[PDB]
Amino acid sequence: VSTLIPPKVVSSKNIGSAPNAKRIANVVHFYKSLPQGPAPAIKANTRLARYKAKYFDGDNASGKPLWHFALGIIAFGYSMEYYFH
Amino acid sequence: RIDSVSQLQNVAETTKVLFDVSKETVELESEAFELKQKVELAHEAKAVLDSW
């Protein structure tokens, strides 16, 4: 006798699958993400975004700003030594 | 997820084929009832004749 009609309705393998939850997530997350960004280091732009670019990028952990800032404090109280002299 | 989807696409058409096919087969058996009565008539005729 005639083969039954349950297989001709699908709406329980289309909404009844687990990656649907991931699908609706990653259509929003990925589709709505700019493939590229603006600029990594730019804070303090006044030729001191350049200071950030040379020293406070994630492209270096080089000791130069530390040295520079340290030397600043040496310059601060030392000048004041000759101001207090 | 794509893998799941592709299966269902092909199914959707082909199931309609099977649906028809099953009913077509059933039709042949309707006609088979006419045959069955022919089989019977032959058996009866031979049986009476054998007794004769």
CB A65 within 8 A of CB A55: yes
End-to-end CA distance of chain A: 113
Q: Which two tokens stand for residue B10?
A: 């092909």
Declared resolution, Å: 4.4
Q: Which residue, among A28, A16, A11, has the nearest Cα to B1 in the 3D structure?
A: A16
Number of residue pairs across A and B with CB atoms under 8 Å? Answer: 29
Q: Which two tokens stand for residue B41?
A: 């008539």
CA distance readout (Å), B16 to A5, A6, A8, A20, A27: 9, 12, 8, 27, 33
Question: Which residues are CB-neighbours of A40 under 8 A, at least 6 positions away?
Answer: A57, A58
Q: Which two tokens stand for residue B50?
A: 């054998």
Q: Which residue, among B19, B1, B20, has the nearest Cα to A9 in the 3D structure?
A: B19
Which of the residues B3, B19, B23, B25 would you substitute to probe the A interface, choosing the one with the greatest number of A C-beta atoms within 10 Å? B19
CB A64 within 8 A of CB A55: yes
In degrees, rounded to 5, the angle at the alpha carbon of residue B23 between the alpha carbons of residues B20 and B26 is 150
Q: Which two tokens stand for residue A27?
A: 């259509």
User: What is chain A written as a DSSP string?
Assistant: -PPPSGGG--SSSSSSSTHHHHHHHHHHHTTSS-SS-S-S--TTTTTSHHHHHHHSSTT---SHHHHHHHHHHHHHHHHHHHH--
- Burial status of residue A7 (CB atoms within 10 A of its CB: 0-12, 13-18, 19 or more): middle
How many alpha carbons fall within 13 Å on the CB side of residue A10? 16
Break sites following residues in chain A (C–N > 2.5 A): none
Which residue of chain B comes nearest to A22, CA vs CA? B1
Q: Which two tokens stand for residue A53?
A: 């670019």
